[PDB]
Amino acid sequence: EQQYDVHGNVISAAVYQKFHVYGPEDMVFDGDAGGLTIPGAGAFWGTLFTSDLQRLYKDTVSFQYNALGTYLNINFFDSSGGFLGHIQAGAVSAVVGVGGGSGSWHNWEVA
Ligand SMILES: [Co+2]
Ligand SMILES: [Co+2]
């Protein structure tokens, strides 16, 4: 796995969360999750680990997050459940629990 610095944010409505991540090569993750968590908003910093960045960006369709431990973990998956990489980030207090949903990466040409 190669490592990359990333940062992001989350807005929770308790059952729904919107995630953004700003990744290397000027790419942006937009993700829409369900999950059992506290409402609120926060920012995070962390590390993206992936053995194939371009594949992560092309093939990600879904994500899952877990805040039950010491960090915020975000895993990214393809349409066949293949694991494409993950982020280890500092904890955000609006994200307890686990959850997940759809998302994808895009460049600056897409809002
Ligand atoms: Co967005
Ligand atoms: Co979407």
Tab-separated table of N, CA, C and O in Angstrom, residues 2-8 21-27 44-50 53 57 86-89 105:
chain	number	residue	atom	x	y	z
A	2	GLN	N	0.509	2.206	-0.932
A	2	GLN	CA	1.007	3.579	-0.846
A	2	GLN	C	0.139	4.384	0.111
A	2	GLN	O	-1.047	4.036	0.274
A	3	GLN	N	0.723	5.391	0.737
A	3	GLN	CA	0.053	6.285	1.646
A	3	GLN	C	-0.004	7.670	1.109
A	3	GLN	O	0.967	8.201	0.611
A	4	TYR	N	-1.069	8.341	1.439
A	4	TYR	CA	-1.350	9.705	1.020
A	4	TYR	C	-2.023	10.468	2.111
A	4	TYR	O	-3.020	9.967	2.642
A	5	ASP	N	-1.665	11.736	2.322
A	5	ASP	CA	-2.341	12.566	3.266
A	5	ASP	C	-3.688	12.934	2.705
A	5	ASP	O	-3.783	13.310	1.511
A	6	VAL	N	-4.755	12.900	3.492
A	6	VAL	CA	-6.054	13.342	3.020
A	6	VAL	C	-6.749	14.127	4.127
A	6	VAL	O	-6.296	14.082	5.275
A	7	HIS	N	-7.781	14.849	3.771
A	7	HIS	CA	-8.625	15.498	4.782
A	7	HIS	C	-10.028	15.442	4.264
A	7	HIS	O	-10.272	15.144	3.074
A	8	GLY	N	-10.992	15.653	5.099
A	8	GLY	CA	-12.357	15.538	4.742
A	8	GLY	C	-13.315	16.118	5.732
A	8	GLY	O	-12.898	16.698	6.720
A	21	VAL	N	-14.230	13.667	0.994
A	21	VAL	CA	-12.801	13.502	1.197
A	21	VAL	C	-12.029	14.141	0.079
A	21	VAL	O	-12.350	13.929	-1.107
A	22	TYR	N	-10.959	14.826	0.383
A	22	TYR	CA	-10.086	15.470	-0.613
A	22	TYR	C	-8.827	14.610	-0.682
A	22	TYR	O	-8.061	14.532	0.292
A	23	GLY	N	-8.654	13.910	-1.783
A	23	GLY	CA	-7.600	12.957	-1.937
A	23	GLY	C	-6.457	13.450	-2.869
A	23	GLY	O	-6.537	14.556	-3.451
A	24	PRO	N	-5.445	12.652	-3.037
A	24	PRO	CA	-4.316	13.032	-3.912
A	24	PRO	C	-4.714	13.123	-5.364
A	24	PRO	O	-5.744	12.627	-5.839
A	25	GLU	N	-3.927	13.901	-6.103
A	25	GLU	CA	-4.226	14.119	-7.535
A	25	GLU	C	-5.531	14.930	-7.709
A	25	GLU	O	-6.229	14.828	-8.724
A	26	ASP	N	-5.853	15.767	-6.697
A	26	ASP	CA	-6.920	16.758	-6.812
A	26	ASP	C	-8.301	16.100	-6.967
A	26	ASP	O	-9.179	16.582	-7.646
A	27	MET	N	-8.475	14.942	-6.314
A	27	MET	CA	-9.685	14.211	-6.494
A	27	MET	C	-10.591	14.367	-5.258
A	27	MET	O	-10.111	14.539	-4.159
A	44	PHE	N	-11.944	16.080	9.416
A	44	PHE	CA	-10.987	15.099	9.791
A	44	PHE	C	-9.744	15.184	8.906
A	44	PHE	O	-9.786	15.636	7.764
A	45	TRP	N	-8.635	14.691	9.484
A	45	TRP	CA	-7.400	14.526	8.759
A	45	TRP	C	-7.002	13.125	8.885
A	45	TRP	O	-7.233	12.486	9.896
A	46	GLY	N	-6.361	12.617	7.888
A	46	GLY	CA	-5.886	11.262	7.987
A	46	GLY	C	-5.061	10.778	6.790
A	46	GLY	O	-4.493	11.634	6.111
A	47	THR	N	-4.934	9.465	6.677
A	47	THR	CA	-4.131	8.856	5.667
A	47	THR	C	-4.967	7.936	4.840
A	47	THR	O	-5.657	7.063	5.391
A	48	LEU	N	-4.880	8.043	3.559
A	48	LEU	CA	-5.404	7.100	2.600
A	48	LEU	C	-4.325	6.029	2.288
A	48	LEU	O	-3.191	6.416	1.914
A	49	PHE	N	-4.666	4.758	2.399
A	49	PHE	CA	-3.845	3.647	2.067
A	49	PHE	C	-4.460	2.964	0.878
A	49	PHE	O	-5.659	2.527	0.934
A	50	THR	N	-3.753	2.795	-0.210
A	50	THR	CA	-4.232	2.015	-1.368
A	50	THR	C	-3.124	1.463	-2.183
A	50	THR	O	-2.085	2.177	-2.336
A	53	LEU	N	-4.235	3.562	-6.674
A	53	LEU	CA	-4.975	4.823	-6.582
A	53	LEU	C	-5.938	5.008	-7.734
A	53	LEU	O	-7.085	5.368	-7.533
A	57	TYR	N	-10.062	5.314	-7.601
A	57	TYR	CA	-10.829	6.393	-8.118
A	57	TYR	C	-11.803	5.943	-9.197
A	57	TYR	O	-12.887	6.491	-9.278
A	86	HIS	N	-8.443	2.256	2.020
A	86	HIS	CA	-9.093	2.770	3.224
A	86	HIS	C	-8.352	4.014	3.709
A	86	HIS	O	-7.217	4.271	3.414
A	87	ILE	N	-9.123	4.772	4.497
A	87	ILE	CA	-8.601	5.906	5.225
A	87	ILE	C	-8.664	5.623	6.686
A	87	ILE	O	-9.629	5.070	7.240
A	88	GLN	N	-7.562	5.964	7.337
A	88	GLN	CA	-7.476	6.063	8.820
A	88	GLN	C	-7.439	7.540	9.174
A	88	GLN	O	-6.492	8.223	8.802
A	89	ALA	N	-8.413	8.018	9.922
A	89	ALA	CA	-8.597	9.470	10.216
A	89	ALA	C	-8.786	9.693	11.728
A	89	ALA	O	-9.152	8.751	12.478
A	105	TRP	N	-15.623	9.016	-6.646
A	105	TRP	CA	-14.558	10.038	-6.765
A	105	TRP	C	-14.761	10.782	-8.050
A	105	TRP	O	-15.109	10.221	-9.107
